[PDB]
Amino acid sequence: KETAAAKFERQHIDS
Amino acid sequence: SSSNYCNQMMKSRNLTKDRCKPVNTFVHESLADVQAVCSQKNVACKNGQTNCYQSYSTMSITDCRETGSSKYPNCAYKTTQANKHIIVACEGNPYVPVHFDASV
């Protein structure tokens, strides 16, 4: 399932 | 619920498929450049702990905030684009961003 680092990327990165 | 960037991206990234989230910030920088902030200027987090870091430069960001008229299932966001320094809280090994503390 999703780690805290993965959740940060999904919610906040739009490269 | 209708086609501005925030309504679209909040749904695609699974933030508003089952709730309306009041605010969220998207950063338009490469993942490794945002990960690089965890070794830049150390500052206190809003909560007083000290694993927060502020980017040396401003970064392209879009702020998404629910309008006063937004109600699940019809979430609606106001989109604000800006270039701001970001503050992230970092943890782990590798020491990577886990929370978005603020933009300034």
Side-chain angles (χ1 to χ4, degrees):
Chain A
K1 243 299 290 165
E2 189 178 54
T3 67
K7 178 183 184 68
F8 178 87
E9 295 161 1
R10 178 179 57 85
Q11 300 192 310
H12 303 292
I13 299 292
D14 176 25
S15 54
Chain B
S1 342
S2 331
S3 298
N4 70 44
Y5 172 83
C6 285
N7 285 202
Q8 299 184 76
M9 207 71 161
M10 291 294 271
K11 197 97 66 178
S12 37
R13 291 298 189 79
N14 183 205
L15 287 99
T16 57
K17 285 181 163 191
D18 57 9
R19 74 179 63 73
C20 293
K21 187 191 180 197
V23 58
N24 183 62
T25 303
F26 289 103
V27 183
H28 298 282
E29 300 297 340
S30 71
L31 179 67
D33 287 351
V34 175
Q35 287 171 324
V37 183
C38 292
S39 57
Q40 290 185 22
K41 181 44 67 188
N42 180 230
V43 292
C45 303
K46 300 182 300 300
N47 71 12
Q49 281 167 46
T50 42
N51 62 324
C52 278
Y53 299 79
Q54 179 170 147
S55 60
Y56 297 133
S57 49
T58 54
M59 290 182 164
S60 174
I61 60 114
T62 306
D63 174 80
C64 296
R65 184 171 283 254
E66 270 182 284
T67 62
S69 4
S70 177
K71 187 180 174 64
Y72 190 78
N74 325 282
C75 309
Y77 290 87
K78 177 182 176 56
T79 300
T80 305
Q81 170 65 213
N83 280 267
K84 294 202 272 165
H85 299 266
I86 64 170
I87 291 118
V88 295
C90 302
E91 283 182 294
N93 208 292
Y95 202 58
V96 294
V98 292
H99 280 302
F100 191 90
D101 205 70
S103 311
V104 297

Short mmCIF file of all heavy atoms in Angstrom, two decimals, chain A residues 4-5 7-15, chain B residues 5 9 13-14 24-29 31:
data_model
loop_
_atom_site.label_atom_id
_atom_site.label_comp_id
_atom_site.label_asym_id
_atom_site.label_seq_id
_atom_site.Cartn_x
_atom_site.Cartn_y
_atom_site.Cartn_z
N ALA A 4 4.30 7.08 2.98
CA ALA A 4 4.13 8.53 3.15
C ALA A 4 4.82 9.33 2.05
O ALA A 4 4.31 10.37 1.61
CB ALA A 4 4.71 8.95 4.47
N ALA A 5 5.98 8.83 1.60
CA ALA A 5 6.70 9.46 0.51
C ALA A 5 5.92 9.30 -0.79
O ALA A 5 5.84 10.25 -1.56
CB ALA A 5 8.07 8.82 0.33
N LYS A 7 2.61 8.93 -1.10
CA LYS A 7 1.44 9.77 -0.94
C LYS A 7 1.80 11.23 -1.21
O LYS A 7 1.05 11.91 -1.94
CB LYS A 7 0.89 9.60 0.47
CG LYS A 7 -0.33 10.48 0.74
CD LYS A 7 -0.76 10.30 2.18
CE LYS A 7 -2.02 11.09 2.44
NZ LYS A 7 -3.16 10.52 1.74
N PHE A 8 2.93 11.72 -0.67
CA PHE A 8 3.38 13.09 -0.97
C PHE A 8 3.48 13.28 -2.49
O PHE A 8 3.00 14.29 -3.03
CB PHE A 8 4.78 13.39 -0.31
CG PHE A 8 5.33 14.79 -0.63
CD1 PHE A 8 4.97 15.86 0.18
CD2 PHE A 8 6.15 15.00 -1.72
CE1 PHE A 8 5.42 17.12 -0.13
CE2 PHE A 8 6.60 16.27 -2.03
CZ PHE A 8 6.23 17.33 -1.22
N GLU A 9 4.09 12.34 -3.23
CA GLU A 9 4.28 12.46 -4.69
C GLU A 9 2.97 12.48 -5.45
O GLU A 9 2.77 13.34 -6.31
CB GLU A 9 5.10 11.31 -5.26
CG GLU A 9 6.52 11.34 -4.72
CD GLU A 9 7.29 10.05 -4.84
OE1 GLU A 9 6.78 9.06 -5.35
OE2 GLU A 9 8.42 10.03 -4.41
N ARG A 10 2.08 11.54 -5.13
CA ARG A 10 0.77 11.50 -5.74
C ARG A 10 -0.03 12.78 -5.47
O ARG A 10 -0.69 13.32 -6.35
CB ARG A 10 -0.01 10.30 -5.20
CG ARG A 10 -1.43 10.19 -5.76
CD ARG A 10 -2.17 8.98 -5.23
NE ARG A 10 -2.24 8.97 -3.78
CZ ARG A 10 -3.15 9.58 -3.02
NH1 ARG A 10 -4.11 10.37 -3.52
NH2 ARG A 10 -3.04 9.42 -1.71
N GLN A 11 0.02 13.32 -4.25
CA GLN A 11 -0.76 14.51 -3.94
C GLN A 11 -0.12 15.81 -4.36
O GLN A 11 -0.86 16.79 -4.50
CB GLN A 11 -1.01 14.69 -2.46
CG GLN A 11 -1.77 13.54 -1.86
CD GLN A 11 -2.23 13.91 -0.47
OE1 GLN A 11 -1.46 14.37 0.35
NE2 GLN A 11 -3.49 13.72 -0.14
N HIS A 12 1.22 15.89 -4.48
CA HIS A 12 1.81 17.19 -4.69
C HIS A 12 2.76 17.37 -5.83
O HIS A 12 3.14 18.52 -6.08
CB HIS A 12 2.52 17.68 -3.41
CG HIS A 12 1.65 17.74 -2.17
ND1 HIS A 12 0.64 18.57 -1.95
CD2 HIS A 12 1.77 16.94 -1.05
CE1 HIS A 12 0.17 18.31 -0.74
NE2 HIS A 12 0.85 17.34 -0.22
N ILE A 13 3.15 16.37 -6.61
CA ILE A 13 4.10 16.61 -7.68
C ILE A 13 3.40 16.58 -9.01
O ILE A 13 2.66 15.65 -9.32
CB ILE A 13 5.24 15.53 -7.65
CG1 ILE A 13 5.98 15.61 -6.33
CG2 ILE A 13 6.15 15.69 -8.88
CD1 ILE A 13 6.81 16.88 -6.10
N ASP A 14 3.61 17.55 -9.85
CA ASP A 14 3.09 17.44 -11.18
C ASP A 14 4.20 17.99 -12.04
O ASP A 14 4.15 19.14 -12.49
CB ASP A 14 1.79 18.25 -11.32
CG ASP A 14 1.25 18.26 -12.73
OD1 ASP A 14 1.53 17.35 -13.49
OD2 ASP A 14 0.53 19.18 -13.09
N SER A 15 5.16 17.10 -12.31
CA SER A 15 6.33 17.45 -13.08
C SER A 15 5.92 17.57 -14.54
O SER A 15 6.01 18.59 -15.21
CB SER A 15 7.41 16.37 -12.87
OG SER A 15 6.91 15.07 -13.17
N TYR B 5 -7.91 23.19 -14.10
CA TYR B 5 -6.80 22.34 -13.69
C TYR B 5 -7.00 21.74 -12.31
O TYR B 5 -6.84 20.52 -12.18
CB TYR B 5 -5.48 23.15 -13.70
CG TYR B 5 -4.29 22.41 -13.09
CD1 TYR B 5 -3.55 21.50 -13.85
CD2 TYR B 5 -3.94 22.66 -11.79
CE1 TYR B 5 -2.48 20.82 -13.29
CE2 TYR B 5 -2.88 21.97 -11.22
CZ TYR B 5 -2.15 21.08 -11.97
OH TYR B 5 -1.11 20.42 -11.37
N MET B 9 -7.14 17.76 -11.70
CA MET B 9 -6.01 17.08 -11.10
C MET B 9 -6.33 16.52 -9.73
O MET B 9 -5.81 15.45 -9.32
CB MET B 9 -4.83 18.02 -11.02
CG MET B 9 -3.56 17.22 -11.04
SD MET B 9 -3.19 16.46 -12.64
CE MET B 9 -1.53 16.29 -12.10
N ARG B 13 -5.73 12.60 -9.27
CA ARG B 13 -4.79 12.11 -8.30
C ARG B 13 -5.45 11.53 -7.07
O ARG B 13 -4.82 11.35 -6.02
CB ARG B 13 -3.82 13.27 -7.96
CG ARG B 13 -2.90 13.65 -9.11
CD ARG B 13 -1.98 12.47 -9.51
NE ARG B 13 -0.99 12.93 -10.45
CZ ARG B 13 0.10 13.61 -10.08
NH1 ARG B 13 0.47 13.78 -8.82
NH2 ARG B 13 0.90 14.10 -11.03
N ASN B 14 -6.76 11.25 -7.17
CA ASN B 14 -7.51 10.57 -6.12
C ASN B 14 -7.56 11.34 -4.80
O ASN B 14 -7.41 10.85 -3.68
CB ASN B 14 -6.90 9.14 -5.90
CG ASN B 14 -7.63 8.28 -4.87
OD1 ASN B 14 -7.07 7.35 -4.25
ND2 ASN B 14 -8.93 8.50 -4.70
N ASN B 24 -5.11 22.02 -1.58
CA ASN B 24 -3.99 21.17 -1.93
C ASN B 24 -3.06 21.98 -2.84
O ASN B 24 -3.56 22.80 -3.62
CB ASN B 24 -4.49 19.94 -2.67
CG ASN B 24 -3.31 19.01 -2.99
OD1 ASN B 24 -2.66 18.53 -2.07
ND2 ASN B 24 -2.95 18.78 -4.25
N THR B 25 -1.75 21.77 -2.78
CA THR B 25 -0.81 22.49 -3.64
C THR B 25 -0.12 21.51 -4.55
O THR B 25 0.29 20.44 -4.07
CB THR B 25 0.24 23.19 -2.77
OG1 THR B 25 -0.50 24.03 -1.88
CG2 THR B 25 1.26 23.97 -3.56
N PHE B 26 -0.04 21.80 -5.84
CA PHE B 26 0.74 20.98 -6.76
C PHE B 26 2.01 21.76 -7.13
O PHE B 26 1.92 22.96 -7.42
CB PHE B 26 -0.02 20.67 -8.07
CG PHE B 26 -1.17 19.71 -7.85
CD1 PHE B 26 -2.47 20.19 -7.79
CD2 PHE B 26 -0.91 18.36 -7.71
CE1 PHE B 26 -3.52 19.30 -7.59
CE2 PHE B 26 -1.96 17.48 -7.50
CZ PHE B 26 -3.26 17.95 -7.45
N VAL B 27 3.16 21.08 -7.16
CA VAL B 27 4.45 21.68 -7.49
C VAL B 27 4.84 21.24 -8.89
O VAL B 27 4.89 20.04 -9.19
CB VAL B 27 5.53 21.24 -6.47
CG1 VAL B 27 6.83 21.95 -6.81
CG2 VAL B 27 5.12 21.59 -5.05
N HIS B 28 5.16 22.19 -9.77
CA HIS B 28 5.47 21.89 -11.18
C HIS B 28 6.97 21.93 -11.36
O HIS B 28 7.54 22.82 -12.00
CB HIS B 28 4.83 22.93 -12.12
CG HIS B 28 3.30 22.93 -12.02
ND1 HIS B 28 2.48 22.04 -12.58
CD2 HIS B 28 2.53 23.82 -11.32
CE1 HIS B 28 1.26 22.34 -12.25
NE2 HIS B 28 1.30 23.40 -11.49
N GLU B 29 7.64 20.99 -10.69
CA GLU B 29 9.09 20.82 -10.73
C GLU B 29 9.33 19.32 -10.81
O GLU B 29 8.42 18.51 -10.55
CB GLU B 29 9.77 21.37 -9.47
CG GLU B 29 9.53 22.87 -9.25
CD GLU B 29 10.07 23.85 -10.30
OE1 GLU B 29 10.97 23.53 -11.07
OE2 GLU B 29 9.59 24.97 -10.34
N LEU B 31 10.51 15.64 -9.80
CA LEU B 31 10.56 15.01 -8.50
C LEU B 31 11.92 15.13 -7.80
O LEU B 31 11.99 15.42 -6.60
CB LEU B 31 10.16 13.53 -8.66
CG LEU B 31 10.16 12.63 -7.42
CD1 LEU B 31 9.07 13.09 -6.46
CD2 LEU B 31 9.93 11.20 -7.82
#
